[PDB]
Design a protein around this ligand. Sequence first.
Ligand SMILES: *[C@@H]1O[C@H](CO)[C@@H](O[C@@H]2O[C@H](CO)[C@@H](O)[C@H](O)[C@H]2NC(C)=O)[C@H](O)[C@H]1NC(C)=O
Ligand SMILES: *[C@@H]1O[C@H](CO)[C@@H](O[C@@H]2O[C@H](CO)[C@@H](O)[C@H](O)[C@H]2NC(C)=O)[C@H](O)[C@H]1NC(C)=O
Ligand SMILES: *[C@@H]1O[C@H](CO)[C@@H](O[C@@H]2O[C@H](CO)[C@@H](O)[C@H](O)[C@H]2NC(C)=O)[C@H](O)[C@H]1NC(C)=O
Ligand SMILES: *[C@@H]1O[C@H](CO)[C@@H](O[C@@H]2O[C@H](CO)[C@@H](O)[C@H](O)[C@H]2NC(C)=O)[C@H](O)[C@H]1NC(C)=O
Ligand SMILES: *[C@@H]1O[C@H](CO)[C@@H](O[C@@H]2O[C@H](CO)[C@@H](O)[C@H](O)[C@H]2NC(C)=O)[C@H](O)[C@H]1NC(C)=O
Ligand SMILES: *[C@@H]1O[C@H](CO)[C@@H](O)[C@H](O)[C@H]1NC(C)=O
Lengths: 199, 597
Amino acid sequence: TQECDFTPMLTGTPPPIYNFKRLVFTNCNYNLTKLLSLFQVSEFSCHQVSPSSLATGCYSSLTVDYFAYSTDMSSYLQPGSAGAIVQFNYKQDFSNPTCRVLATVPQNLTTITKPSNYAYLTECYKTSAYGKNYLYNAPGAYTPCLSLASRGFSTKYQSHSDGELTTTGYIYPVTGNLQMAFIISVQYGTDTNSVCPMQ
Amino acid sequence: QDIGQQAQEFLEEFNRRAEDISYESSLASWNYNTNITEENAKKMNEAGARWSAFYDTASRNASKFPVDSIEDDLIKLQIQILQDRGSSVLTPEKYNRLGTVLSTMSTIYSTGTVCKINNPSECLVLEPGLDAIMADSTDYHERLWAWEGWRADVGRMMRPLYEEYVELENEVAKLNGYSDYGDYWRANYEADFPKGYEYKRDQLIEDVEKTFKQIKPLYEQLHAYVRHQLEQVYGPELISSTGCLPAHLLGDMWGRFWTNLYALTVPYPNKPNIDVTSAMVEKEWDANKIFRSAEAFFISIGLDNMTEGFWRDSMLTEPTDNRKVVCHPTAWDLGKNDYRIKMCTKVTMDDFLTAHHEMGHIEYDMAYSGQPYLLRSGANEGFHEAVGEIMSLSAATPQHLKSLDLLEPTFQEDEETEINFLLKQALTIVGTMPFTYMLEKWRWMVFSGEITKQEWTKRWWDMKREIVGVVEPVPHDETYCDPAALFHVANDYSFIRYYTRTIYQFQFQEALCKAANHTGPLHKCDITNSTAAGDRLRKLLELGRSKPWTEALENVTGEKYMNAEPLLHYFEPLFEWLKKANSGRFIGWKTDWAPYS
Ligand SMILES: *[C@@H]1O[C@H](CO)[C@@H](O[C@@H]2O[C@H](CO)[C@@H](O)[C@H](O)[C@H]2NC(C)=O)[C@H](O)[C@H]1NC(C)=O
Ligand SMILES: *[C@@H]1O[C@H](CO)[C@@H](O[C@@H]2O[C@H](CO)[C@@H](O)[C@H](O)[C@H]2NC(C)=O)[C@H](O)[C@H]1NC(C)=O
Ligand SMILES: *[C@@H]1O[C@H](CO)[C@@H](O[C@@H]2O[C@H](CO)[C@@H](O)[C@H](O)[C@H]2NC(C)=O)[C@H](O)[C@H]1NC(C)=O
Ligand SMILES: *[C@@H]1O[C@H](CO)[C@@H](O[C@@H]2O[C@H](CO)[C@@H](O)[C@H](O)[C@H]2NC(C)=O)[C@H](O)[C@H]1NC(C)=O
Ligand SMILES: *[C@@H]1O[C@H](CO)[C@@H](O[C@@H]2O[C@H](CO)[C@@H](O)[C@H](O)[C@H]2NC(C)=O)[C@H](O)[C@H]1NC(C)=O
Ligand SMILES: *[C@@H]1O[C@H](CO)[C@@H](O)[C@H](O)[C@H]1NC(C)=O
């Protein structure tokens, strides 16, 4: 019917992994070969769907999350790797057809600007007299320490307490070109399928 | 205000504020130990002198709730740690006197020289001058010169300084509620928690003496074969056949480890030990494949992977910049989720069986990280190094080494080269068990007044012939201080944590090699690819100090006490071989022959 333009994905600065931006689209004509031609795709790992038949199906909802993420830590987003990523920053939903792309954003993409550091969280807990009470992430949801981490981290392992909760960041600088991550997930419709491709 | 609840408020405020101050005071030490300079030396002191003031304010705050009213468990186990003040209970001038004595003794031990009679200008320090004479040489008179020179030069200066340290530390530990300074050291093994897992301070003295009578039919077979091999080198007039060994012929300045006697007492000298260093350097193993193959071990038994910042923040090799690091392997736990290993790794099979040790330290540190602040350690002082040394026992077998292609696949296990391995293990393990028991018993008896001031040098050599079986080569009198010529006596360190962790890492291994379905001798067991032996190790690593060590030992083994039967089950083929080799020899010694007479 209309165009679901990917302009907010191709402007500004891509956020860190805990503060990921979401771009749920509906009722349009899409072309993911337009999207993936602009980047240097380094991975296309999909679950319960194929990368050849994803770009032309008819669905009901189309969810795209994106964040700035170095492609050297690509083994921490995989399922069954209980590190500090999938516990506190972002846990991917698997009870829906999903994929995962890791791009290597070129310098000829002039509209995307570059941040100063990559960043994630190493703990998000709730202190008491009996120790730490960890707040693990729910699949597909934001972290419970989100309003605390939105002050900015300046160094490695700089914490931020506010009352009950206590979060802790970790930063490291950006080398070379920028690298992102796109967690694309669909949902099959039952009555009306308005997410149909551009032909 | 229901004193347990005020204690809960105070411990919550302490746990909130004691995490930002204890991370800065450890980052300031990581930034010194790997980048030794002067500005880092200033930052380390000025950032570690705020944590001590904060902790002392916390102790003076916590010495207000009487612990006979707090009816909880983890809110009574932390007030009692914070009430352990330490040396800061003294008067404000006896503390400076104690600091003066305890620094003068350490400087006297550090700057210690022996100058020879031939050329008096030529003098030798201990490291690295005297521990090549007393580790390589087979000359009687040279070893006697080095031993008597070190004793006569660093004992006469530390005798009148070890008699003020006893008087001051019997006051430090008397103003804290203990009886003497022996109890202040023995109270790391206490427990008065839930039921049946109670341990007194005075049970350790009888438990150590009960375990030693099990390890002393094996030490008497070791000290009747070592003595014969020394008689076959030095001669029958210097070494007898029914007396003790003279002290300087032990491959060490203090006779602690007998490891340097392996060149003399090797059973089969034609069968070499396994060495994969040639096979490591001829297959291009860098200093990072060692740490990434020592991690596929822990991920195979069922423990955790390392963090993401561990690989970019640690120092896994010596740097080629102008940084002057100290090259000694340590495993750090800095605070807010970062674990770092400092180590100068080179490609040998001695930095391969130390990556497993240093990783077993931070796999313990990564597991109890939910425990508040004070309950973050081993259950006593011997637990943290017993689980670091059951990893080096299984990372060195000739099946774990054969599964990494560091050995030829057509191996045959070479029957003589298991006695050649068990003897090299026994000279290190059973060689030091009479020494760390006798030295600690002498210290516990001179601290409590059972040995008066006029008989230290007499009772030291009276106990060293009945426990260790080692005689002196030179007559000594009451101006010498032979115990204070050791590093752990001059620098105020507890020494039973080396005896009660050679007993724990065979109770651990006899349980983990029972859960992994191992049928065979214990010295070739392998906890690899076995999650059942990593699901019950994780029940021990998870606790910290939240449970007493008796319960944390019953959860793994099945028996809440020390035992020397797994040590004698480890050294089982060696014992049967030694009883064939010591056929027609006098097992034991008679404490009346002396090399001076
Ligand atoms: C979708 O976007 C792509 C972005 O390149 C458009 O371009 C085609 O891409 C295919 C990819 O194999 C090429 O084979 C074609 O030659 C490209 N055509 C042109 C004109 O560049 C593609 O046209 C878009 N789809 C639709 C339906 O417009
Ligand atoms: C520890 O790290 C290793 C990295 O090698 C993880 O192994 C990967 O596990 C995923 C799980 O499906 C597999 O898809 C990958 O193929 C594995 N990597 C390799 C190289 O084989 C392992 O899962 C991690 N373990 C934990 C507990 O985080
Ligand atoms: C080792 O420590 C020295 C401290 O004397 C470091 O030198 C300073 O490092 C800071 C770090 O940003 C710089 O801002 C200063 O300009 C440096 N001053 C001087 C006089 O060099 C040194 O960088 C450290 N080395 C490493 C490798 O970290
Ligand atoms: C020890 O207890 C004293 C109270 O006797 C604490 O001092 C208070 O600290 C708070 C900090 O928020 C201040 O607001 C109060 O004004 C202080 N009161 C007094 C009388 O000094 C002190 O912080 C405690 N220290 C520790 C380490 O717990
Ligand atoms: C632990 O398990 C792994 C995987 O089961 C073993 O590695 C395999 O060993 C066989 C031996 O015939 C080889 O053919 C395979 O190629 C190996 N696979 C891998 C991924 O290495 C390993 O040998 C086991 N370790 C021990 C000590 O038994
Ligand atoms: C951008 O594209 C132009 C034309 O295709 C090419 O000449 C240039 O090298 C590209 N930029 C980079 C950084 O490769």
